[PDB]
Amino acid sequence: RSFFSFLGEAFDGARDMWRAYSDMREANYIGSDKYFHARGNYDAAKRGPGGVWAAEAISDARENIQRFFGHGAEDSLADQAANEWGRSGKDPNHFRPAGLPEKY
Amino acid sequence: RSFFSFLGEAFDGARDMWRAYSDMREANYIGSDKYFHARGNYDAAKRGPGGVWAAEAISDARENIQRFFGHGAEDSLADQAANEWGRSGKDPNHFRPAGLPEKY
Amino acid sequence: RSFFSFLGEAFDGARDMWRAYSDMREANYIGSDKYFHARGNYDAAKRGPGGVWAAEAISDARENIQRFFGHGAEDSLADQAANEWGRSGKDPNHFRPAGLPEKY
Amino acid sequence: RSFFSFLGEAFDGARDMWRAYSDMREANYIGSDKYFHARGNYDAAKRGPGGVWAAEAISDARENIQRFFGHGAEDSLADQAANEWGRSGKDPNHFRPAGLPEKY
Amino acid sequence: RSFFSFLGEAFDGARDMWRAYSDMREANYIGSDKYFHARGNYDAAKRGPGGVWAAEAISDARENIQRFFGHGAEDSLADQAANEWGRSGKDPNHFRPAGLPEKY
Amino acid sequence: RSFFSFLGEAFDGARDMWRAYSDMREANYIGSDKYFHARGNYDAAKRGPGGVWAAEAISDARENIQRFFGHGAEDSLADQAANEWGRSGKDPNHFRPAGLPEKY
Numbered sequence A, B, C, D, E, F: 001r002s003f004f005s006f007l008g009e010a011f012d013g014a015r016d017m018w019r020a021y022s023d024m025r026e027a028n029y030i031g032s033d034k035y036f037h038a039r040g041n042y043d044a045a046k047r048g049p050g051g052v053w054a055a056e057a058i059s060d061a062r063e064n065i066q067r068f069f070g071h072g073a074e075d076s077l078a079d080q081a082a083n084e085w086g087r088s089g090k091d092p093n094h095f096r097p098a099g100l101p102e103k104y
Helices: A002-027 A033-047 A049-069 A073-087 B002-027 B032-047 B049-069 B073-087 C002-027 C033-047 C049-069 C073-087 D002-027 D033-047 D049-069 D073-087 E002-027 E032-047 E049-069 E073-087 F002-027 F032-047 F049-069 F073-087
Strands: none
Touching (some): A002 C002, A033 A073, A049 A073, A049 B049, B032 B049, B032 B073, C002 C033, C002 D002, C033 C073, C049 C073, D002 D049, D049 D073, E002 E049, E049 E073, F002 F049
């Protein structure tokens, strides 16, 4: 039964990762990147082990795709630290920009 | 226009990775793991950059999921080397088991 | 980065279009067609350019499928005007039936 | 038009069935199985005929997959009765565990 | 590891079931229904246990959807026997119509 | 029953449209655009009415997405004529470049 739960946690983790980027686009707040990268990872990790796995799979692929197209080396490191913070169960609101609406 | 090719190459790379594991199940040949972990990576990489990205995203996730459930540390390293060989465009038949049918 | 945002806006636009028809079925209000056709298009357009594109792709296909099966010519024109109203950022509540619940 | 509505009801029924198991994992309440099996089926059936069809397709497949892996015969019968109760429009809260949060 | 094979066998079984109906539409041979309802079940079952499960899940849903729309009771029984024959690994060409092309 | 064939023809038409662009990337032949924009439309239309509908839905969306990103007005017209030729069941090899391999 644990395998089927792990997969459900993974798809749910995938949806929470998607929700973070969907919200990032909606907010349109400059310098919110770190907050949503931590939140999607935090939410996915909260689903369980499948969520942790899905968040890491999605974060690594995103980082690699941006790298290929022209995303700066130092800029990728900041994205990497924000993902790890959330995934480790630490508070995403740590990277929260001051004027971001309560919904996010 | 290079962005859509990249995505098409990625989905195609994803299908070639799927095809490798689908074939691995069909063959039912003991030792295969490596050859196939490397055929899928070779075929996906051949699609273009999107295929390389998709093969790596899929290989890393597979390795991590196997690790969580109970796959041995040394056993994962062999799977890792096999994936890299194929993805780098080197010949997969290098890891080919002697009694494997021509179709694979 | 704009291409990846355009695709996210498109999938989100696709979900908002789906949500409009899902809600239309739930409400079961006679003569609500115009309201939900405008709302799904309005919501999708609000996501951004990807949403505008997805709303138009979905609206054109829906109109063409109904035409093939037996939907009246004049009946299609009313569906067409309602989609355009919403997509152009104009208020969907313009086509709102008087006894429709607040949730919709 | 009824066929397209039946399919929309089915996908929506599929989502309500998924939502029940996603919620079951979130709650982590022991002996909640019956409640969520009835709720997902009740919610899906409420969508319409497509929802009834999708709930039954999903419930039968779930029951068969668990049977193959090692789920007890008597244990499957309890899962079967809970699915039927909900699908028939009877109150899921009938199987509600006393300390389960209001959201579920 | 038997869990992932089961899922891969299921998706592959799902594709073989799809392929049977896709081919049924292509052939446009009157009487086919049975042979094809049984070729798809045979191919899916050949994938392994996941394929058997997927063929049965797909066959039961198809039978139920056809029943709701207006498919005759006696007509459903013939479809039921044809599915079982294939799924049990028996030769599908048993129900083969005389003038059906070699590709099918 | 004509409704399910229509949907199956549509998904199959969608796959044939995908196959055309997947092949276009593989070939890497300069000028192809048209032949392929017309092979996919021909193959999809051959599936039946669902295929015709899916080819048109896909062709219109592709044309609109290309327009938004920076595709020239005159360049879009050539893509439009090529799609119509194929979809109308006329021979795609009409736009075939002289040095294109036999597989395509």
